[PDB]
Write a protein that binds this ligand. Structure first.
Ligand SMILES: N[C@](CC1c2ccccc2Oc2ccccc21)(C(=O)O)[C@H]1C[C@@H]1C(=O)O
Ligand SMILES: N[C@](CC1c2ccccc2Oc2ccccc21)(C(=O)O)[C@H]1C[C@@H]1C(=O)O
Ligand SMILES: *[C@@H]1O[C@H](CO)[C@@H](O)[C@H](O)[C@H]1NC(C)=O
Ligand SMILES: *[C@@H]1O[C@H](CO)[C@@H](O)[C@H](O)[C@H]1NC(C)=O
Lengths: 743, 761
């Protein structure tokens, strides 16, 4: 029935866990030392400071209506039912500074959203309270739990920890934390290896199983913890027996508490933990230390706290137990400030300032409680002034700019955490802050001690190189492995290698599908010096034999035509060899046909021996051969295709993309028939002509198959030119040895 | 005011006795049809339960009824007494609420359920049809007897599918009813594979001009002659008025907002001729009617609001008499439609309490020490939700089972009404079926569903097609597809793609790949080519004459192998023509190809030998012909090794033929042999320019010259003819056969013309 009802112009609700939950036959158990009396005393100190302040509500005096939760949701609901009997002696409640428990906060918010009563919590960090569909009048000065999921996941990105293993305790703290951390890791390209679940009812056998499952996965050397204090402590103790070394990344459940390590400091080292940042309040220590149960008559539970912190019976039944005197006091030897005190004050001001601003909007003519302010519209105050506060921390330390109290769209506080690294120094084990997360990373790597000189835990071995080495996934999830491709086809995509050219041979990763025709264009190389020299010698011989002619003549015109044909045959060798191949592919074929027709006419000149009529008839036959090769050209077209099917080894492209054995066979068949007729006629000077014709016929018969069976990359044209120039040279040798006998 | 009776087992209840305050007041006039009739129904149900042996025999059932005044805040203030008198106090005498049967408006029910969930007080509504009370995350201890608002959406979706209606319109309203139900209707329509136009909604403060504009917007699509109405009574009335003003013909599938109400069709009977509406199924209670009629303020002291209801109904003041014998009879009294639901809720709560009592106390029919701290969670989860009993004041031989599903909602049961005219100048609503779990429509009373003039055809936007692929669906509306006919050149290979194959334009309607029929497109080996082959047969007769020539060789004083060679060439070309015409095959094309070349070479060699012998003036002739034959053999061997097999060829894409060519073609190698023959003929003519005159065998020389000239002319005429016919292989073979047969016949005739004269002389 104990309650605080300090009267005032505006009465702020209060709700604290003064009494622990009774596990026996009593609803309320003991007196809570830290989260109980100390937090309500902090709220009372903040209220007194606000009342004494001449800049925050100078005229309006803030009242206090403080009740107890008994660490139970039903009891909290029953008590907070007194907060709604003002608009629906009763006291009008402007707001409720209550919380300290997620279930209690949830129940109180559910009850107070119906009656439009703003509520500010100082310790509730449940993620379930972040949605305004179910709690539209709830705010908190502490960040929600899932913020820590973003606090250390980026740490995984900071140290390049892409492969992690998650361990958590089932319930409400670690449950939502696992989903939040998994979402953050997926958004940060981090994959989860294992996901275990720790329970309060489990025993060492199942703990050892979790460690054993963790050990049989060498790639995952980092474990992300979402567990309570006892679970983390016992897990560290259990891993001590297993001789397991890890790099723990724990949430506030571990924090900077010395109870977690216990007698297992050699397995917890290098651990990274997150702690809610909270500066101490200097004035609160002085206010709380100078408190005795004689002047603090406004605190009904203060006598019980005096009888709990110190064994006292002076209030009642002095002779029953060990009575105490005023010698018992409070000092810095046995009193330590609770971590979540600066938040509680930050809650109270968060109301007062809002009210002040509300007054400046509704009662701007005087510094008093105007009648228009008596309505105390909860919706307007919450959605207009409570969520739009930017006041700095009332008791922030000197030179601390980052002390602004703000509420986001969901009413949550600003997320500011401290990163602690468990290190050994000298010969003493202690924690040491190595950075802060105020919505950004500020880690101090230079003062961080790792497990063994390094923390390598990446599952992916190494990024794959370019040039057909990028490969693709091998059947896994995290990263992939690297396998090569055959270099003929360029990796046009990031997964497969596909051909995009006849010869291709890609150059580097950039512009892999280059043109690179890889044609058979051959210059005057070592194998080409011979044919050109032979052609030059033949041309010189023809020039000499036509210069010696005409001047001394006593076939005539037929002999001149034969000499011209011999010169054409000699220059056909140079005509065949040409590095650039234009669209005019008929030059070589017409040259060969003209040479064959000239040889046929030269043979027919001796065959015939009216003679002038035969000299014209052989020219007419040459014209018929010319029209035949023209009809041939009317059926063959050039191109850019490659006749070699060696793919990667196909580094030579045919000069003219056309079927060589399509009508060239027919043309050579006609030539063979004509020359065979000439040979048969000659078989009936003349002997030398027949002999050289026979040598040419067997030479051509021998050189024909090798141009098709060998299929050389570039030597087919060279061999054809060599055969032609050899035949022409034999004919010229005969036609030059004949004058040698003549002279 | 409060309404407290007994107290052994107090039952909560909230009723809208007073309407919402107009002039900014708390409560206004008394709601006669929603606050008094339902209150009296609950009281009558409680009395019947009390005076009942098989339900709560030894335990009495009380009541703590309150007025909500149709306000959520006032309802919250009144419901605070439900929790403050049962468990809030401690761990006007407070009364322990066991269950709450109340809540008519959706917002009131939501607020009351939100308040009562925290205190584990079960609540059973009787008129809250809101769809946002179905989730148990926010309302754990809420149950209802009436079905939610998406059951009628499901019913209309099933109705639309039953009548084969796909492309339909949609009209909605602003608020919970009209926006929450429209989303559910769209979801089931997607699940029903039907199309929703999703037209504009109504803001309940909408001008006549805007209503007319929305009517024109609905008239924009002519194929969707069906509109769905998730609108309130006033919105539906305004829409009917607008449709009547604009003279628009429509059929409207409506919801409970329209129902079987005659107040929305006043002055708009012409616009509504095939209107389909859904009304929540309910039946009247005769016992409740008897109980309510025999009610007067003289003895009805239980109801604090009865005096106000009497004053509002009958003009009486109770200070000055002004009234006497104003008994409430059946003439001005009509039973409200949701009164059986109140009785069902009260009886369900009573049955749940009785079952819990029997389970906890199977020995005695009286309260135990374990029943004082009743648990709302256990009662709701194990007893309230698990109820299966016949509806009271209704014979048990009827499918009326008051049950709650897994979400605690009621059992769907609706009636379908058609706004029709029986034939006279009057209009009325006629029931045409019911929806409990499936449609039960009868096609016997609906006017537009009669077989005459069709059953109001309002089918999908488009129509199915067979020869036109369905691949032109309208962008953004896949419900109006265009039957685009694919070109006949492209066959059907997939479900909706018309793609060509090459081996035929349209094999069949299998719609699975392309079929290549095995046939020959140049199969001219029939009577059509009867004329050419017979000519070849004539050449065979010439071969027989060759045998006679052999006999003539035995007694002719006037070389002799040249005639045999010519006859052999004639036989060879005749055989080549026969092979080409009778049967074209891979092994039947190369043989004739070699044979024609061999015959041409033999003829050329014979002509060359004859002209050489003429110009000169048996071993030499034999050597020359052997050399020519060897050259021809080399040429044909080169042709064979170049390409021996024949795989055929395909036709042009402009048509679809079976086989363009029997074997390989488009080769100019035969042009080489043609040019060689032309050159040989030219050489023969050049020699005969002076050698033609020969006294020795003058007739033979003249015949040889004439044969050479005729062969040259035939070749010169046939070469352009062959080039022209190469584009049409159907007649090219016939033309070539005719040409070679004519050449052979001409040669034979020229050879035999002087022989007959010489023999006769
Ligand atoms: N802020 C806390 C967080 C709390 C918590 C913190 C660390 C480890 C376990 C753990 O148990 C849960 C479970 C669910 C939700 C919140 C928590 C809160 O109660 O909301 C708690 C410090 C506040 C207080 O009780 O003083
Ligand atoms: N069951 C109703 C349905 C109601 C409703 C019915 C038709 C048209 C408009 C309309 O307004 C809304 C809006 C949201 C949810 C429900 C409704 C309820 O009030 O919940 C109402 C019959 C019950 C009664 O008041 O007696
Ligand atoms: C993480 O990787 C980035 C580049 O991928 C590198 O710059 C950075 O130094 C790495 N951090 C480490 C190794 O801690
Ligand atoms: C709807 O179409 C189906 C064809 O699937 C037909 O069997 C049925 O009779 C139709 N119903 C009508 C026209 O009401």
């Amino acid at each position: 029935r104990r309650e605080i009802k300090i009267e005032g112009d505006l009465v702020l609700g209060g709700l604290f866990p003064i009494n622990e939950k009774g596990t026996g036959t009593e609803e309320c158990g003991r007196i809570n030392e830290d989260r109980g009396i100390q937090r309500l005393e902090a709220m009372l100190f903040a209220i007194d400071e606000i009342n004494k302040d001449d800049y925050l509500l100078p005229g309006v005096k803030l009242g206090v209506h403080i009740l107890d939760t008994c660490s139970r949701d039903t009891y909290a609901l029953e008590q907070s039912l007194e907060f709604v009997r003002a608009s629906l002696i009763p006291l009008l409640i402007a707001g409720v500074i209550g919380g300290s428990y997620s279930s209690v906060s949830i129940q109180v918010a559910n009850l107070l959203r119906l009656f439009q009563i703003p509520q500010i919590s100082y310790a509730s960090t449940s993620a379930k309270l972040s949605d305004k569909s179910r709690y539209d009048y709830f705010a908190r000065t502490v960040p929600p739990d899932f913020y820590q999921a973003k606090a250390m996941a980026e740490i995984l990105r900071f140290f390049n920890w892409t492969y992690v293993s998650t361990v958590a305790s089932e319930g409400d703290y670690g449950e939502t934390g696992i989903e939040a951390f998994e979402q953050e890791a997926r958004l940060r390209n981090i994959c989860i290896a294992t996901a275990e679940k720790v329970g309060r009812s489990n025993i060492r056998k199942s703990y050892d199983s979790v460690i054993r499952e963790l050990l049989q996965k060498p790639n995952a050397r980092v474990v992300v913890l979402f567990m309570r204090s006892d679970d983390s402590r016992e897990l560290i103790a259990a891993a001590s027996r297993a001789n397991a070394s890890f790099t723990w990344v724990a949430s506030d459940g571990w924090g900077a508490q010395e109870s977690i390590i216990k007698g297992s400091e050699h397995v917890a080292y290098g651990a990274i933990t997150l702690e809610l940042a909270s500066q101490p309040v200097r004035q609160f220590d002085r206010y709380f230390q100078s408190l005795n149960p004689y002047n603090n008559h406004r605190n009904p539970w203060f006598r019980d706290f005096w009888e709990q912190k110190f064994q006292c019976s002076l209030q009642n039944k002095r002779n029953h137990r060990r009575v105490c005197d005023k010698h018992l006091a409070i000092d810095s030897s046995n009193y330590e400030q609770e971590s979540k005190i600066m938040f509680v004050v930050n809650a109270v001001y968060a109301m007062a300032h809002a009210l002040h601003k509300m007054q400046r909007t509704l009662c701007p003519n005087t510094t008093k409680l105007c009648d228009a302010m008596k309505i105390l519209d909860g919706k307007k105050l919450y959605k207009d002034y409570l969520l739009k506060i930017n006041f700095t921390a009332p008791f922030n330390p000197n030179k601390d700019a980052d002390s602004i109290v703000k509420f986001d769209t969901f009413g949550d506080g600003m997320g500011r955490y401290n990163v602690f690294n468990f290190q050994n120094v000298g010969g003493k084990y202690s924690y040491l802050k190595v950075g802060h997360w105020a919505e950004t990373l500020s880690l101090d790597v230079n003062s961080i001690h790792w497990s063994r000189n390094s923390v390598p835990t990446s599952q992916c071995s190494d990024p794959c190189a370019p040039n057909e080495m990028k490969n693709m996934q091998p059947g896994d999830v995290c990263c992939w492995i690297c396998i090569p491709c055959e270099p003929y086809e360029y990796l046009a995509d990031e997964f497969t290698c596909m051909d995009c050219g006849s010869g291709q041979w890609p150059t580097a990763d950039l512009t892999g599908c280059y043109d690179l025709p890889e044609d058979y264009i051959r210059w005057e190389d070592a194998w080409a010096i011979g044919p050109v020299t032979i052609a030059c010698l033949g041309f010189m011989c023809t020039c000499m034999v036509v210069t010696v002619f005409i001047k001394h003549n006593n076939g005539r015109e037929l002999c001149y035509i034969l000499l011209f044909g011999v010169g054409l045959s000699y220059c056909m060798t140079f005509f065949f060899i040409a590095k650039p191949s234009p669209v005019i592919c008929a030059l070589r074929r017409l040259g060969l046909g003209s040479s064959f027709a000239i040889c046929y006419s030269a043979l027919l000149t001796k065959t015939n021996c009216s003679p002038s009529s035969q000299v014209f008839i052989c020219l007419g036959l040459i014209l018929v051969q010319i029209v035949m090769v023209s009809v041939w050209l009317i059926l063959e077209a050039p191109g850019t295709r490659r006749y070699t099917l060696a793919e990667k080894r196909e580094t030579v492209i045919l000069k003219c993309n056309v079927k060589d054995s399509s009508m060239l066979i027919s043309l050579t068949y006609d030539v063979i028939l004509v020359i065979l007729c000439t040979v048969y006629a000659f078989k009936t000077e003349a002997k030398f002509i027949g002999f050289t014709m026979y040598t040419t016929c067997i030479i051509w018969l021998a050189f024909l198959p090798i141009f098709y069976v060998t299929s050389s990359d570039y030597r087919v044209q060279t061999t054809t030119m060599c055969i032609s120039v050899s035949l022409s040279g034999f004919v010229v040798l005969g036609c030059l040895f004949a004058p040698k006998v003549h002279i | 005011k409060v309404l407290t009776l007994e107290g052994d087992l107090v039952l909560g209840g909230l009723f809208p006795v007073h309407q919402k305050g107009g002039p900014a007041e708390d409560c206004g006039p008394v709601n006669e049809h929603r606050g008094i009739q339902r209150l009296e129904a609950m009281l009558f149900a409680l009395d019947r339960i009390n005076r009942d042996p098989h339900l709560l025999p030894g335990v009495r059932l009380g009541a703590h009824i309150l007025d909500s005044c149709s306000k959520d805040t006032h309802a919250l203030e009144q419901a605070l007494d439900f929790v403050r008198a049962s468990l809030s106090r401690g761990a006007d005498a407070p009364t322990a609420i066991t269950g709450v049967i109340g809540g008519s408006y959706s917002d009131v029910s939501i607020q009351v359920a939100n308040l009562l969930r925290l205190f584990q007080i079960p609540q059973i509504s009787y008129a809250s049809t809101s769809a946002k009370l179905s989730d148990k995350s926010r309302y754990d201890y809420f149950a209802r007897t009436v079905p939610p608002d998406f059951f009628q959406a499901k019913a209309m979706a099933e109705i639309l599918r039953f009548f084969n209606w796909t492309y339909v319109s949609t009209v909605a309203s602003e608020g919970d009813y009209g926006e929450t139900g429209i989303e559910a209707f769209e979801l089931e329509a997607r699940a029903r594979n039907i199309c929703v136009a999703t037209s504009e909604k109504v803001g309940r403060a909408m001008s006549r001009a805007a209503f007319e504009g929305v009517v024109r917007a609905l008239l924009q699509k002519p194929s969707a002659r069906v509109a769905v109405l998730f609108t309130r009574s006033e919105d539906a009335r305004e829409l009917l008025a607008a449709s009547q003003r604009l003279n628009a013909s429509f059929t409207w599938v409506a919801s409970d907002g329209w129902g079987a109400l005659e107040s929305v069709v006043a002055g708009s009977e012409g616009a509504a001729e095939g209107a389909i509406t859904i009304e929540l199924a309910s039946y009247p209670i005769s016992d409740f009617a008897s109980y309510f009629q025999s009610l007067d303020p003289w003895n009805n002291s239980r109801n604090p609001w009865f005096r106000e209801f009497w004053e509002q109904r009958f003009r009486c003041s109770f200070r000055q008499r002004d009234c006497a014998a104003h008994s409430l009879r059946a003439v001005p009294f009509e039973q409200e439609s949701k009164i059986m639901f109140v009785v069902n809720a009260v009886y369900a709560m009573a049955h749940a309490l009785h079952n819990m009592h029997r389970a906890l106390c199977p020995n005695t029919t009286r309260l135990c020490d374990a029943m004082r701290p009743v648990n709302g969670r256990r009662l709701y989860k194990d007893f309230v939700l698990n109820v299966k009993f016949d509806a009271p004041f209704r014979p048990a031989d009827t499918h009326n089972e008051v049950r709650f599903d897994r979400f605690g909602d009621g059992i769907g049961r609706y009636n379908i009404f058609t706004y029709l005219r029986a034939g006279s100048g009057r209009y009325r609503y006629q029931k045409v079926g019911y929806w409990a779990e499936g449609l039960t429509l009868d096609t016997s009373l609906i006017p537009w569903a009669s077989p005459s003039a069709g059953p109001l055809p309002a089918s999908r936007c488009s129509e199915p097609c067979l020869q036109n692929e369905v691949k032109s669906v309208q962008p953004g509306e896949v419900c109006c597809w265009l039957c685009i006919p694919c070109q006949p050149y492209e066959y059907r290979l997939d479900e909706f793609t018309c793609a060509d194959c090459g081996l035929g334009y349209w094999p069949n309607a299998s719609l699975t790949g392309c079929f290549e029929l095995p046939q020959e497109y140049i199969r001219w080996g029939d009577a059509w080519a009867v004329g050419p082959v017979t000519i070849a047969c004539l050449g065979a007769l010439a071969t027989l004459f060759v045998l006679g020539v052999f006999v003539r060789h035995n007694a002719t004083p006037v070389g002799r192998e040249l005639c045999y060679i010519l006859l052999g060439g004639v036989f060879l070309c005749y055989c080549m023509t026969f092979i080409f015409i009778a049967k074209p095959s891979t092994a039947v094309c190369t043989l004739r190809r070699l044979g024609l070349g061999t015959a041409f070479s033999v003829c050329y060699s014979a002509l060359l030998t004859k002209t050489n012998r003429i110009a000169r003036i048996p071993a030499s002739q034999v050597a020359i012909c052997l050399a020519l034959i060897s050259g021809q053999l080399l040429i044909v061997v080169a042709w064979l090794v170049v390409e021996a097999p024949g795989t055929g060829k395909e036709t042009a894409p402009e048509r679809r033929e079976v086989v363009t060519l029997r074997c390989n073609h488009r080769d100019a190698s035969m042009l080489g042999s043609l040019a060689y023959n032309v050159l040989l003929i030219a050489l023969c003519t050049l020699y005969a320019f002076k050698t033609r005159k020969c006294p020795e065998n003058f007739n033979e020389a003249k015949f040889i010259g004439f044969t050479m000239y005729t062969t040259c002319i035939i070749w010169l005429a046939f070469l352009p003819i062959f080039y022209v016919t190469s584009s049409d292989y159907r007649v090219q073979t016939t033309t070539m056969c005719v040409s070679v047969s004519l050449s052979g016949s001409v040669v034979l005739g020229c050879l035999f013309a002087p022989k007959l004269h010489i023999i006769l002389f």
